[PDB]
Amino acid sequence: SNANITSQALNEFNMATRRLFDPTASNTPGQPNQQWIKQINDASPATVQKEI
């Protein structure tokens, strides 16, 4: 019902490069789930500390 296919190498890739560029992210300002850099640009100090 929610079967999702992933591999070891693919998961490592999506782990390492989900914070650099995300093809599933939104590239236009004003939408949610934007790029990680842009989200950091607006995040609070506590949020970026947790992300660290």
Binding site: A43, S44, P45, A46, T47
Partner: peptide, 30 residues
């Protein structure tokens, strides 16, 4: 009786303090 300006000034200062603390809390993310 006429009001001393010190009281009004302190009231405005304290309201500004409330506002500034709320903005600082919001900025930190709370």
């Amino acid at each position: 009786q006429p009001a001393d300006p010190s009281g009004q000034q302190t009231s405005t200062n304290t309201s500004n303090l409330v506002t500034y603390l709320t903005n600082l809390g919001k900025y930190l993310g709370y």
